[PDB]
């Protein structure tokens, strides 16, 4: 019935930035508009009730304003701990949530530490072979992990996994797993993951030859 239009859907800001999320109600809800902060894998926690009021256990940098249809949620000085998804919620008519705003932190460029893991004996005995390439504590999030088997580009046989931005040092971690049959694994020699990232002047290649680890 009443729709909350939350803008933007996501944002990136720097430490101390003034961050403002806007929630427009499709009709008047007076001040019956609340704001939630949700950490990944956790339930949302109430920060602002009744458009402007601070709930217990909420830092003073969080605030809200507005009454009627247009509402603003403000982080006056964005901290790395404040990275989360934020939702407005109205109760003027039943309960509806805004689309959400995930807030990401901007920091200085940090190159990833790269680690390659060959397939285990136990996995090879099981018929599959997985090469794992790990990237540790990098910023920005954008990172390329390119797989080469005997200098041949691998397609459709890898999977990536990026952690949530760290609430302390604002970095990311990445896992890329190239998966083959044991038959295709034993048909080749050189296995390499090439990592491309802004923090690296040139791409880093971690490689190994099959059976020599």
């Amino acid at each position: 019935d009443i729709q909350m239009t939350q803008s933007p859907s996501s944002l990136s800001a720097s430490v101390g930035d003034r961050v403002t999320i806007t929630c427009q109600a499709s009709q008047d809800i007076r001040n019956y508009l609340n704001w939630y902060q949700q950490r990944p894998g956790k339930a949302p926690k109430l920060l602002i009730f009744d458009a402007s009021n601070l709930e217990t256990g909420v830092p003073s940098r969080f605030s809200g304003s507005g009454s009627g249809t247009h509402f603003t949620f403000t982080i006056s000085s964005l901290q790395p701990e404040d990275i989360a998804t934020y939702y407005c919620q109205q109760y003027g008519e039943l309960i509806t949530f805004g689309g959400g705003t995930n807030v990401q932190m901007k920091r200085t460029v940090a190159a990833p530490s790269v680690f390659i893991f060959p397939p285990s004996d136990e996995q090879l005995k099981s018929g599959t072979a997985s090469v794992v390439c790990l990237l540790n504590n990098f910023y920005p999030r954008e990172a390329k992990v390119q797989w080469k088997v005997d200098n041949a580009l691998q397609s459709g046989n890898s999977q990536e996994s990026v952690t949530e931005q760290d609430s302390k040092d604002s970095t990311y971690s990445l896992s890329s797993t190239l998966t083959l049959s044991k038959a295709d694994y034993e048909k080749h020699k050189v296995y390499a993951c090439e990592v491309t990232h802004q923090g690296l002047s040139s791409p880093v290649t971690k490689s190994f030859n099959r059976g020599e680890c």
Binding site: D1, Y32, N34, Y36, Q38, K42, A43, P44, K45, L46, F49, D50, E55, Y87, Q89, Y91, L94, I95, T96, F97, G98, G99, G100, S113, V114, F115, I116, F117, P118, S120, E122, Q123, S126, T128, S130, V132, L134, N136, G156, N157, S158, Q159, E160, S161, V162, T163, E164, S173, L174, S175, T177, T179, K206, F208, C213
Partner: protein, 225 residues
């Protein structure tokens, strides 16, 4: 303290009915002061309130789900329940129970919440992960040892938790979100343990504990370099 705990199945086959129970402790749900609601959240999507129940039997419902939803309340058990019918993949979500009616005589905001229970709408049955010890073939980094556990082909993707026998000072565990396999339908992730070489001597080994779904935790021996 007031605590809420969702209970329910991990999986419900498509078109069947999802049943969830919230166990409330530290407050009486028959009290006129508070209402009791269910909220859900599909992975990567926004929160969605479902329904609210009150001791008088009054019920509120999300208009887009009222037809498929039944919310009720057991004052003797001090529990309230949710029933969602006709579940499809669109109903795969984390389901939260929460208290509302905090300041006004009608639902206002939700506090506190339950931990949330994932419900996966799938015809598939649970697949346990095959956990494999991983040994670094790269150069070991700066006085530490890097070992890993491969957690391959499990379903559902959550709840998957990996812990290690070693922890504390000098130890950092890194976990990654489960990734859908290119193979098909199953999920794979990894866990990385960085710890001082002092703590992972040759011949010794560290144990990584992979607890998935409701099954007991798998314990796999990961040899030190």
């Amino acid at each position: 303290q007031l605590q809420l705990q969702e209970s329910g199945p991990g999986l419900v086959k498509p078109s069947e009915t999802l049943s969830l129970t919230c166990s409330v402790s530290g407050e009486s749900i028959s009290n006129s002061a508070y209402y009791w609601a269910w909220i859900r959240q599909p992975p990567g999507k926004a929160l969605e309130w479902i329904a609210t129940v009150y001791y008088t039997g009054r019920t509120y419902h999300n208009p887009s789900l009222k037809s498929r939803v039944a919310i009720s309340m057991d004052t003797s058990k001090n529990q309230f329940s949710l029933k969602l019918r006709s579940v499809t993949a669109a109903d795969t979500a984390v389901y939260y129970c929460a208290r509302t009616g905090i300041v006004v005589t009608t639902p206002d905001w939700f506090d506190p919440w339950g931990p949330g229970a994932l419900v996966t709408v799938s015809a598939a049955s649970p697949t346990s992960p095959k956990v494999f010890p991983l040994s670094l073939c790269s150069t070991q980094p700066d006085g530490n040892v890097v070992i890993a556990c491969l957690v391959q082909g499990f379903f559902p993707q959550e709840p998957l938790s990996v812990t290690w026998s070693e922890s504390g000072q000098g130890v950092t565990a890194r976990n990654f979100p489960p990734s859908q396999d290119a193979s098909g339908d199953l999920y794979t992730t990894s866990s990385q343990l960085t710890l001082p070489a002092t703590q992972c001597l040759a011949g010794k080994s560290v144990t990584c504990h992979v607890k998935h779904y409701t099954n007991p935790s798998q314990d796999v021996t990961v040899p030190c370099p």
